[PDB]
Amino acid sequence: DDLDEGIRMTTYDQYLSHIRERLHITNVPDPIYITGASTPDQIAASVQA
Amino acid sequence: MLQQPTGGYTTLEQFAFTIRNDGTNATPTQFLQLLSYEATENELVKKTIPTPETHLPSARNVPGNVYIEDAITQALFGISAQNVNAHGYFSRLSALALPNTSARLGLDGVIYNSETINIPFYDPAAVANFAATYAKLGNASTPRYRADMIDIYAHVGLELAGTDAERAAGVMPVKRAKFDSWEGSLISLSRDVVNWKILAFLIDLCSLEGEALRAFKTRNRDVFRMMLFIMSTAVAANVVNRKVTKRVDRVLEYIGVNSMRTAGRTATITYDLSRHEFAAKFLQLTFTRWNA
């Protein structure tokens, strides 16, 4: 895998500081937590919603 | 957000409660083992504790992030605190009572008006359960809602000094506590206790349910007993030392009896009347949760 390739992730403070309020004003459900027991289909449902 | 384990937040090593003793960080249980009790002719019987009021005092419009844990711990064990009901910021806990409130209670023991970065905070559901009860500290001064500050101490005695048979009976002889002692032992004890992050204890106390709760109540009985001990010394009529062949036994008379004293003394922390009303309230709520 290339350096751009991989599993993206970010700190919660970065999430809160930036993306979260934009999630609020765009009128969407707060994106689901992933327990690790979570289905990929559920993640698809969340990225969809 | 700090996740809450299947046990309490108290299971986390981050929230260990430990008085200093013999140069080490002793657990409360291994301090309470040092304690011994002389019985006296008087008897404590425990009356039913009145149900705490339905009312949650208004969290007045406060721009600031209140330092609540400091306010509570200093009101209960603080060496110098007074007029604890003048400011009345305890009511602020009821900001946390609402569903989906923006406010967060940080592990710092501060009630932030909104979630903010790089400040870990307790799970909001847990805090809501905790606030639904302990916001009532905010009405510890209002005349309609004041707790009894005499009878409640019976429970304290039973929960501290009481042998398991005395606890089952609901009635124990008034006792006189004593322990091998270093200079300033009760001051140092109380200050080791002011530093305790007790909102962890109160929050697990209000949030946990079922066996997971009961498993908490056994595990932290000694902690609750240490808090009760510091309050007991705060309200004890007198606190002497005894020479005992080149050793000293600190002795407080009496466990479970509030003397209503308010004049300050070197030996132990003192309650102003406001601290008495507050502590009475705190005991009302906490014992109510403890026996259900």
Q: Do A13 and B115 touch (CB under 8 A)?
A: no
Q: Which residues fall within 8 angstroms of residue A7, CB to CB, at 6 or more apart?
A: none
Structural domain tally of chain B?
Answer: 1
> Which residue of chain A is at minimal alpha-carbon distance from B114?
A16
Optimal mutation site among A10, A13, A19, interface B, most CBs of chain B within 10 A: A13
**What letters, b where the CB count within 10 A reaches 16 and e where it falls short, cover B234-270?**
bbbeebeeeeeeeeebbbbbbbbbbeebeeeeebbbb
CB B252 within 8 A of CB B233: yes
CB B286 within 8 A of CB B205: yes
Q: Is B114 on the interface with A (CB under 8 A)?
A: no
Listed in sequence order, the DSSP H helices in B113-247 are 124-134, 153-160, 164-169, 185-194, 198-207, 211-219, 221-235
Phi, psi of B96 (to 5 degrees): -80, -15
A 1-49 residues inside an 8 A Cβ radius of B: 13, 16-17
Q: Determine how many CB atoms are found less than 10 A away from the CB of residue B47.
A: 12
Cα torsion angle, B13, B18, B21, B26, sign: negative
Write out chain A residues lying below 8 Å of B117, CB-based: 13, 16-17
Amino acid in the structure at residue A47: V
Optimal mutation site among B102, B104, B117, interface A, most CBs of chain A within 10 A: B117
Q: Determine how many CB atoms are found less than 10 A away from the CB of residue A18.
A: 10
Closest CA to B172 of B194, B156, B150: B156
Q: Which residues fall within 8 angstroms of residue B80, CB to CB, at 6 or more apart?
A: none
Range of the domain at B181: 1-292
> Which residue of chain B is at minimal alpha-carbon distance from A21?
B115
Write out chain B residues lying below 8 Å of A16, CB-based: 115-117
Write out chain A residues lying below 8 Å of B112, CB-based: none
Closest CA to B100 of A17, A30, A46: A30
Of all residues in chain B, what percent are helix, strand and coil, respectively (each to 5)? 45, 20, 40
Write out chain A residues lying below 8 Å of B118, CB-based: 13
CB B123 within 8 A of CB A23: no
What SS3 class is residue B166?
helix
Q: Do B118 and A17 touch (CB under 8 A)?
A: no
Optimal mutation site among B2, B104, B115, B118, interface A, most CBs of chain A within 10 A: B118
**Annotated resolution, angstroms:** 3.0
Cα torsion angle, B11, B15, B16, B18, sign: negative
